[PDB]
From a paper:
Gene expression in the IncP-1 plasmids is stringently controlled by a network of four global repressors, KorA, KorB, TrbA and KorC interacting cooperatively. KorA is a 101-amino acid, homodimeric, protein with an N-terminal DNA-binding domain (DBD), containing a helix-turn-helix motif, and a C-terminal dimerization region, joined by a linker of four amino acids. In this study, we have determined the structures of the free KorA repressor and two complexes each bound to a 20-bp palindromic DNA duplex containing its consensus operator sequence. The structure of KorA consists of two domains, joined by a highly flexible, four amino acid linker, which retains its mobility even when bound to DNA.
The crystals of free KorA contained two dimers in the asymmetric unit (ASU), each with two N-terminal DNA Binding Domains with four α-helices and a C-Terminal Dimerization domain containing a single β-strand and the final helix from each monomer. The NOEs correlate with the X-ray crystallographic B factors for the protein and confirm that the linker is flexible. The structure of each domain is well-determined from the NMR data, and is consistent with the crystal structures. The structures of the DBD (residue 6–66) from both techniques fit with an RMSD of 0.92 Å, while the CTD structures (residues 71–98, dimer) fit with an RMSD of 2.9 Å. When the protein is removed from the DNA complex, the DBDs collapse towards each other, giving additional fluctuating contacts which keep the protein compact. Dynamic interactions observed between the two DBDs include salt bridges between R57 and E18 and hydrogen bonds between R48 and Q11/Q15. The mobility of the KorA DBDs, in the absence of DNA, is likely to be due in part to the different possible electrostatic interactions between the two domains, giving rise to multiple conformers of similar energy.
Author numbering:
A (entry chain A): 1 to 99
B (entry chain D): 3 to 64, 70 to 101
Write the structure that this text describes.
C-alpha cells in the first residue's frame, strides 16, 4: 500500500453497494481521511477484524470497478517471504501502469 | 475442544466475520453445545457451522502477513495457490 481514495472515488466505490452506514464511516475515515484502523476499533467498541472487514469491503468494491485489462484482485494471508514477493510484483505492476 | 470466555475474546479479535459466526463459536467452544444444534436452529449446513467454529479455534491455536493487491492475473492465481498450499500445510505441519 498505501491504500487511499478521494471522496469522488469513495462515492464510486459505494455506488450501488450493499453496505451499512457504520461500515461507510469507518471506510471513509481510513481510506479518504487516512486514519489508522485501530482508532475506529477503540472508539466504536469493535474488533480490529470487524474494522478491517469494513475497510476491505469498500476498497474491494472500488478496485473491482477499476481493474486494468489483464489484472485481478487478491486478498490472502501469506508467510512473510511470499508477502515480500507480492509487494515487489505490486511495485513492478504500478510502474508499468504509470508508464 | 473448549475455550474460556477470556480465550474466546482473544481469538475473535482479528476475525473478519459476522456476529452469527462468533455466536455459533461461543455456543460450541465456550458453552459446550453440539454443532448440530446450531445447524438445526439457524438453518445452516454443518459445513458452515464447522467452518465458523474452526476459524475461532484456529485463531486460538495459531511468520505471516496479510496482503491485498491488484496484480497481473498470472500472479493473482499464484497468490491463491500459495494461500491454499499454505493452509493445507498448516492443517498438518507436525
Amino acid at each position: 500500500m498505501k491504500k487511499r481514495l478521494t471522496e469522488s472515488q469513495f462515492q464510486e466505490a459505494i455506488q450501488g453497494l450493499e453496505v451499512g452506514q457504520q461500515t461507510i464511516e469507518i471506510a471513509r475515515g481510513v481510506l479518504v481521511d487516512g486514519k489508522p484502523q485501530a482508532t475506529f476499533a477503540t472508539s466504536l467498541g469493535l474488533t480490529r477484524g470487524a474494522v478491517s472487514q469494513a475497510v476491505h469491503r469498500v476498497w474491494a468494491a472500488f478496485e473491482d470497478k477499476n481493474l486494468p485489462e489483464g489484472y485481478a484482485r487478491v486478498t490472502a494471508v501469506l508467510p512473510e517471504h511470499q508477502a515480500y514477493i507480492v509487494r515487489k510484483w505490486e511495485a513492478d505492476a504500478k510502474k508499468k501502469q504509470e508508464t
